[PDB]
Each structure stands twice: as C-alpha cells, then as structure tokens.
Amino acid sequence: EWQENKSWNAHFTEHKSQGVVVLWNENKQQGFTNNLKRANQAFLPASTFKIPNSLIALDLGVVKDEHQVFKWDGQTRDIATWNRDHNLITAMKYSVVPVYQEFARQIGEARMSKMLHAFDYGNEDISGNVDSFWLDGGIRISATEQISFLRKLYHNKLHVSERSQRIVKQAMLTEANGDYIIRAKTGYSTRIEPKIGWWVGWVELDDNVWFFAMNMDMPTSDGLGLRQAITKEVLKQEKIIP
Amino acid sequence: WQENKSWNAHFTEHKSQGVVVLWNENKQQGFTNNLKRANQAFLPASTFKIPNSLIALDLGVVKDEHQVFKWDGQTRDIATWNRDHNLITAMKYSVVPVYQEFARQIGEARMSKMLHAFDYGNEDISGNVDSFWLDGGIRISATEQISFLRKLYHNKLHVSERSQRIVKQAMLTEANGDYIIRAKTGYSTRIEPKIGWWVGWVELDDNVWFFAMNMDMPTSDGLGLRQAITKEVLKQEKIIP
Numbered sequence: 001e002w003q004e005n006k007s008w009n010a011h012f013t014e015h016k017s018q019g020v021v022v023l024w025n026e027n028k029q030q031g032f033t034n035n036l037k038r039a040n041q042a043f044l045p046a047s048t049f050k051i052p053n054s055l056i057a058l059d060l061g062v063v064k065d066e067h068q069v070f071k072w073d074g075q076t077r078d079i080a081t082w083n084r085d086h087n088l089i090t091a092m093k094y095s096v097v098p099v100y101q102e103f104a105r106q107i108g109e110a111r112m113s114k115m116l117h118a119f120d121y122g123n124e125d126i127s128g129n130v131d132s133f134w135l136d137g138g139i140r141i142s143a144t145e146q147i148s149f150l151r152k153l154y155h156n157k158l159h160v161s162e163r164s165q166r167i168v169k170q171a172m173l174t175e176a177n178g179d180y181i182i183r184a185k186t187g188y189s190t191r192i193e194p195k196i197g198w199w200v201g202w203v204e205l206d207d208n209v210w211f212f213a214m215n216m217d218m219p220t221s222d223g224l225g226l227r228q229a230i231t232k233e234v235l236k237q238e239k240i241i242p
Numbered sequence: 243w244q245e246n247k248s249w250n251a252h253f254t255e256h257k258s259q260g261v262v263v264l265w266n267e268n269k270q271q272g273f274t275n276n277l278k279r280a281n282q283a284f285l286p287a288s289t290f291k292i293p294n295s296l297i298a299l300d301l302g303v304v305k306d307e308h309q310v311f312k313w314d315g316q317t318r319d320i321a322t323w324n325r326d327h328n329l330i331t332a333m334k335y336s337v338v339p340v341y342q343e344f345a346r347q348i349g350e351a352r353m354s355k356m357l358h359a360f361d362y363g364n365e366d367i368s369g370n371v372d373s374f375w376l377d378g379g380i381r382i383s384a385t386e387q388i389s390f391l392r393k394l395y396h397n398k399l400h401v402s403e404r405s406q407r408i409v410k411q412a413m414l415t416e417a418n419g420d421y422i423i424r425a426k427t428g429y430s431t432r433i434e435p436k437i438g439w440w441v442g443w444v445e446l447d448d449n450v451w452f453f454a455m456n457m458d459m460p461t462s463d464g465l466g467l468r469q470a471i472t473k474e475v476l477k478q479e480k481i482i483p
C-alpha cells in the first residue's frame with residue numbers, strides 16, 4: 001500500500017525536475033510516494049542492476065570475495081575512475097560497468113534468468129545481450145519493485161547465501177554517521193529513452209529502516225546530484241534524517 | 243613501529259597526554275608518537291565489546307544483529323542504556339549491561355579459550371566473569387589492539403567468517419565518499435589511570451590504515467578528544483582530507 005503525498009513535488013519543481021520518490025516504513029509497513037502512477041512505472045535499471053548482479057556473482061563464486069581484484073582490461077573509457085583495477089567495493093562505488101559486464105558473461109544467460117526469477121526482479125526478462133540487457137535490453141523494474149527487492153535483501157530472504165547478501169550490503173554502503181546509515185546504489189539509464197536517473201536503497205535508523213527508490217528524468221549528466229539531493233530533501237521533510 | 247614525535251603537537255594543543263598508533267596495511271609499517279606508551283598495556287574497558295561480540299555471536303549467545311536484548315528495567319546514569327537494544331545499537335551506545343549478560347552466558351572457560359585463540363592482550367580473565375575487562379586482570383596495549391584488529395579485518399580469527407562480518411558491520415562509525423571508519427571507543431575509569439581509547443581502522447579505496455589510541459582522561463569532559471586527536475593525526479598524514 002502506497003499513500004500519495006504530493007507536497008514532495010515542490011522539491012522536484014524547485015529543481016526544474018520531474019520524477020518520483022517512494023518510501024517504505026518498515027516498522028509500520030506503510031508506503032508513501034509523490035506519484036502513484038510513476039512509482040509503478042517500470043524502467044531499465046541500468047547501474048542499479050549492480051545489486052542483483054553482485055549477489056549472483058558472489059553466490060556462484062564468480063567473485064570470490066570483496067577483495068578480489070579485477071584488473072583493468074587496458075581499454076581507456078570516458079569515466080576516468082574506470083581505467084584502473086577494482087574490487088567489488090570500488091566497482092560499486094565508481095559504478096564500473098565493464099567489471100559487471102565480465103561477471104554477466106561468466107554467469108551466463110541460463111543462471112542469470114533463473115536468478116532473476118528467484119529474486120522476482122522486475123519483469124524478470126533478460127532479453128537482449130547477456131552483457132548489456134540491463135542497459136539496453138528487455139528488463140524493466142519500477143520504483144515499488146525496487147523496494148520489494150531491497151526489503152528481501154535487507155532481511156537476507158533472497159535465494160542466495162546469507163554471505164552473498166551481507167557482502168553486497170557492505171558494498172552498498174554510501175554514508176554513515178551518528179544519525180543514520182544509507183546503503184544504496186545510483187543509476188543512469190541513457191541508452192534507451194526516456195533518460196532517467198535512479199537512486200535506490202535504504203536508511204537505517206536506531207529503531208527502524210526506511211526503504212527508498214527514486215527516479216527522475218535526466219536529460220543530461222549535469223543533474224545527477226539531484227538524485228540524492230531531492231531524495232534527502234524528502235527524507236528531511238519527513239523527519240527521517242536531520 | 244617508527245616514532246614520529248611531531249604528533250605530540252596535537253596532544254599538547256589540547257592540554258593532553260597519550261599515544262596514537264597507525265598501521266599502514268599495504269606497506270606493512272607502523273608509526274607512533276610514543277613507542278613506550280604504544281606498548282603499555284591497559285584495561286580495554288568498552289573496547290572489549292569487539293571480542294565479546296565475536297564470541298557471543300560465534301557461540302550463538304547472540305543469534306544475529308537484530309535480536310533484541312530487553313532493558314532489565316534498572317535505571318542507569320547513561321540514558322541511552324535504559325531501553326531495548328540490538329547488537330548494532332548496543333555497540334553504538336556502548337551498553338555495558340547487555341555485554342555483561344553476554345559474558346555470563348559465555349562463561350569463564352569459553353571466554354578464556356577464545357581470548358587465547360585471539361591472542362588478546364595478556365589473555366588473563368581473572369576477576370568477575372562479567373567485569374574483568376573493566377576491573378579485572380586483562381590488559382592490552384595499543385599495538386596489541388592493532389594486531390587483533392588486523393586479524394578481524396582479514397577474517398583470520400578463530401570464529402566463523404559470519405561472526406567477523408557481523409562485528410565489522412556493528413563497528414561501523416562513519417562513512418562517506420572518502421573513507422569508512424570501523425572502530426570502538428572506550429573509557430577505563432574503575433581502576434586508575436583513567437584513560438580513553440579509540441581503536442579501529444580507516445578503509446580507503448586502495449589501502450587500510452589501522453589505528454589505536456589511548457589518552458589520559460581525568461574527566462568525561464575531554465572524551466571528544468579521542469576522535470578529534472586521532473583525526474588530526476590522520477589529516478596530518480594525508481589519510482583523510
């Protein structure tokens with residue numbers, strides 16, 4: 001169940017932006033969003049797919065652990081932080097697509113599909129290239145479906161080892177201080193219209209957890225910081241964070 | 243351990259005495275402002291919550307980081323203690339009575355065996371089974387803390403990998419786009435000298451720096467200096483911005 005709260009639209013409008021934030025209060029089992037229809041609109045996950053891809057790679061032993069080093073392939077790419085060696089922690093942090101494309105190739109289509117059905121991940125459709133389907137293939141997931149997935153991960157309820165789930169949650173770590181912890185992943189779907197930015201994850205408090213999933217129209221990269229900025233304004237409006 | 247006395251400026255600054263120890267994991271090199279004090283062994287006090295958590299999890303005394311340990315209804319001086327807690331919050335607010343109950347359930351024999359496996363300090367649990375790390379015979383130095391923490395970091399202690407991952411989760415203190423700090427504070431008051439502790443590590447993209455500091459702490463007023471002085475050292479060494 002999602003209650004609509006259109007007052008959050010002011011934070012989009014303020015920033016000349018259009019999109020949706022979806023929040024889920026774990027203790028109360030209640031959801032909230034500014035736009036019910038867009039909350040259920042499915043889009044390409046793009047880099048947010050690094051969450052399930054990580055889980056599958058670890059569960060299958062494609063990735064041994066979070067210290068294993070994936071050597072740069074020597075190809076210079078546009079994002080400078082990609083042109084160096086990575087481990088799982090840094091490949092998540094810097095959203096290093098070619099590292100995850102190598103995982104996908106090794107996982108292979110059969111296991112990939114089986115896993116995404118186990119996860120109930122969006123439309124469970126991996127059609128397209130095994131190495132890019134989540135960037136330009138047939139898979140789609142909505143913000144509310146992201147939340148349903150993330151809740152399973154939070155509770156170690158996905159059909160992969162507990163260990164895999166704990167390592168991915170570690171790798172998702174974004175921010176922590178004395179008030180909250182955020183575990184999350186950004187994304188930016190550019191290859192297929194509409195261009196959209198994602199931020200999905202959760203906020204751990206002492207006594208509750210708030211799951212979130214947002215997406216917004218993103219015609220250029222110059223708005224990418226608004227993913228987190230708008231989300232955090234919403235969280236502050238709702239007194240989830242100071 | 244190389245000595246770097248220039249870090250004394252940060253203690254002098256704040257009218258303070260103590261020691262910071264750093265270990266550069268990639269280079270396998272350590273640095274401290276005071277070699278003697280780096281190796282002086284003190285009561286661990288609340289820093290004992292690290293091994294105590296590991297042992298409680300490995301033995302199933304704590305099932306997971308969500309299990310709730312209900313307040314025993316006794317009002318204590320630290321308000322945050324007077325409420326239900328889980329492992330995460332018990333660590334955050336350094337809730338001694340929760341960890342005293344763990345220690346009773348663990349028991350003397352298993353606690354001793356585990357502290358030998360960990361090579362923890364002088365491996366001596368003499369005193370009350372639920373207070374020996376506050377006012378019994380156990381002693382650990384800043385350099386011994388680092389040896390212990392390295393083993394934890396690398397999942398090399400003799401408890402399950404899962405126990406180690408959980409405790410490192412529960413140690414999470416600060417994270418941002420520059421670093422992650424996993425650490426535990428302490429304040430040893432019950433038996434002189436009164437000293438504050440901070441032990442842990444800083445994770446970077448490409449290295450880890452382990453730390454352990456202790457300082458004289460005649461009152462609770464100066465407790466913020468544990469982190470503040472450590473961070474001045476880290477900043478001077480270009481480990482954090």
Ligand SMILES: *C(=O)N1C[C@H](NOS(=O)(=O)O)CC[C@H]1C(=O)NNC(C)=O
Pocket residue numbers: 045046047048094095096097135185186187188189190191
């Ligand atoms: C993920 O959506 N990626 C990889 C990288 N992610 O950064 S994000 O997590 O801050 O959004 C850059 C955007 C996106 C991607 O690969 N974009 N380009 C292509 C050709 O798909």
Ligand SMILES: *C(=O)N1C[C@H](NOS(=O)(=O)O)CC[C@H]1C(=O)NNC(C)=O
Pocket residue numbers: 286287288289335336337338376426427428429430431432
């Ligand atoms: C730990 O050394 N404790 C518990 C609590 N710790 O907070 S800290 O981690 O900021 O240091 C307060 C101090 C200390 C302790 O229990 N002190 N007093 C007594 C009577 O044991």
Ligand SMILES: [Cl-]
Pocket residue numbers: 169170173410411414
């Ligand atoms: Cl963590």
Ligand SMILES: [Co+2]
Pocket residue numbers: 010011014233
């Ligand atoms: Co606003």
Ligand SMILES: [Co+2]
Pocket residue numbers: 117120124
């Ligand atoms: Co299905």
Ligand SMILES: [Co+2]
Pocket residue numbers: 154155308
């Ligand atoms: Co749970």
Ligand SMILES: [Co+2]
Pocket residue numbers: 251252255474
């Ligand atoms: Co200074």
Ligand SMILES: [Co+2]
Pocket residue numbers: 358365
């Ligand atoms: Co012995």
Ligand SMILES: [Co+2]
Pocket residue numbers: 364365
């Ligand atoms: Co001995």
